[PDB]
Design an enzyme around this catalytic site. Structure first.
Site, mmCIF file in Angstrom:
data_model
loop_
_atom_site.group_PDB
_atom_site.id
_atom_site.type_symbol
_atom_site.label_atom_id
_atom_site.label_comp_id
_atom_site.label_asym_id
_atom_site.label_seq_id
_atom_site.Cartn_x
_atom_site.Cartn_y
_atom_site.Cartn_z
ATOM 1 N N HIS B 39 -7.143 -43.949 -3.561
ATOM 2 C CA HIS B 39 -6.852 -43.488 -4.916
ATOM 3 C C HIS B 39 -8.085 -42.989 -5.657
ATOM 4 O O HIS B 39 -7.938 -42.512 -6.791
ATOM 5 C CB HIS B 39 -6.048 -44.494 -5.749
ATOM 6 N N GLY B 141 -12.916 -50.888 -12.301
ATOM 7 C CA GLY B 141 -14.027 -50.453 -11.498
ATOM 8 C C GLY B 141 -14.327 -51.345 -10.311
ATOM 9 O O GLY B 141 -15.254 -51.037 -9.552
ATOM 10 N N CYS B 143 -12.311 -51.779 -7.659
ATOM 11 C CA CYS B 143 -11.629 -51.393 -6.436
ATOM 12 C C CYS B 143 -12.635 -51.070 -5.326
ATOM 13 O O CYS B 143 -13.750 -50.579 -5.564
ATOM 14 C CB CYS B 143 -10.727 -50.177 -6.704
#
Lengths: 302, 296
Positions: B39, B141, B143
């Site tokens: 993503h 932030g 991920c």
């Protein structure tokens, strides 16, 4: 609750851990630049450990008596001295993994990460809080002495604890990196009791602020109190009195929530006098005292 | 006794930052490949309903900015493996540990190295819940932060972080990009299955409680495995198998308490409650220590 005890990443400290052996006693040491720091009881035998004469025991030691190893690689000792309950071994190689660092002496209530080590090899990392009785609730087996506690701010490692002993109740005690014990303990193989412990008020207050940040605010009452009034009451419930430094470290959370520190104290005072009345705070009927105001900021914001 | 994470240094030396457009997250740099959640290629509008094969064909190597510290690594190749993007870079990571990719089973634990902007922030233990969520501490932030276990200098990576559900719990994938649980990498509200309690872990923790001298909950009663499981199922605990009973052997031998006798105490706890008392400090039965964790 959405809160975790979170340790600092341990890599910068892992690169500093070595083993130190004297005779048959092995423990861990901390290698920064060209010095290795370790508990002075490494020089003891079992005949000496009930009340070792450390000065006389050290006299009988030479540089060639100390086996310092990074893994299985020996570091040559070129000098030795004792500072309080820490031995400093000067070695001929400066550790290339030395981080920016400082040695600091912490206050009760402050938290730090412990890197538990055996034979110079890191095994686990967890967060501890120094209790008001100067003990920590660690997980430390035989061979863990010399493991250190630390905080990291902007890639500078502040070392605050070096592990020395286990007390009768299973809690742990140790020194700062200048070798001064936290608390009344001494490095001898004798029975020494942890004093009576109290609850860390500043950290409970930080936890109430964390609850407010998250929308859980039923306990905010309409009262205020003075700091002296509060401290006198708190002591009757086995809570620590607040210092001026504690009031100041709550500043940021007070600003973030708009709840005055003294109003929050009045709220805690009601919780102490009246109980929780079956309600919960952050999903718990227990107040938590091992999260500092910095820990809250480090987790709630980030 | 308490919750202890593995030392994180071997993993810290692998974390980098990956940026595409205005989207930034963390990647894992092993040899000449950086792994990160796919993503990262989405704008905020793309995330609402992404066709990832479509979005990816519209990207070239140069839309991906990989930074290790402040040094940029050049992307010279990219592919997508399920929900993970694999970026080939022109430099091998000198600090790559011996490693494996493993898919963990529910009830198993791992350490998480939470990272922001490619920099490690904190380390803690999580368990894979039976409903395939984890109760972590992840903010915007985070991920691409990973979960792992370490065995004799070998890092087994088992989790990469992708999302936070409405209840506050967290969901992500293995390092092959397959989610744990029925989740999808889309910006939409998603619920998990009903959670259940990891019975073998509660028993391990009660053994830890006895070893540490906390014994108020024990009894002289007993139970059969089947009768215990009937009660477990009634209270949304997972079944206890014979293999679980076996795994608890060392703990049972160390103490003097047969597995099925510990099961009889747990049954009463589920039926009666703890009645304001606590075990190892907790007002609640703890299920995130495995038998192996307890033995360490």
């Amino acid at each position: 609750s959405g809160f975790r005890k979170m340790a600092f990443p341990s890599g910068k400290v892992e690169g500093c851990m070595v083993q130190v052996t004297c005779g048959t006693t092995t423990l861990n040491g901390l290698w920064l630049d060209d010095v290795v720091y370790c508990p002075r009881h490494v020089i003891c035998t079992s005949e000496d450990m009930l009340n070792p004469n450390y000065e006389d025991l050290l006299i009988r030691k030479s540089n060639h008596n100390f086996l310092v190893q990074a893994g299985n690689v020996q570091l040559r000792v070129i000098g030795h001295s004792m500072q309080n309950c820490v031995l400093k071994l000067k070695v001929d190689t400066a550790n290339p993994k030395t981080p920016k660092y400082k040695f600091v002496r912490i206050q009760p209530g402050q938290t730090f990460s412990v890197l538990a080590c055996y034979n110079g090899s890191p095994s686990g990392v967890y967060q501890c809080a120094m209790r008001p009785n100067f003990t920590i609730k660690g997980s430390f087996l035989n061979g863990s002495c010399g493991s250190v506690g630390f905080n990291i701010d902007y890639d500078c490692v502040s070392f605050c604890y070096m592990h020395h002993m286990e007390l009768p109740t299973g809690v742990h005690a140790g020194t700062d990196l200048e070798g001064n014990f936290y608390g009344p303990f001494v490095d001898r193989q004798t029975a020494q009791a942890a004093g009576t412990d109290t609850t860390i008020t500043v950290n409970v207050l930080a936890w109430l602020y964390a609850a407010v940040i998250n929308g859980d605010r039923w306990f905010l009452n309409r009262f205020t109190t003075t700091l002296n009034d509060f401290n006198l009451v708190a002591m009757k419930y086995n809570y620590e009195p607040l210092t001026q430094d504690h009031v100041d470290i709550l500043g940021p959370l007070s600003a973030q929530t708009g709840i005055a520190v003294l109003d929050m104290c009045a709220s805690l005072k009601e919780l102490l006098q009246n109980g929780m009345n079956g309600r919960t705070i952050l999903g718990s009927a227990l107040l938590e005292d091992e999260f500092t105001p910095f820990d809250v900021v480090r987790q709630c914001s980030g």
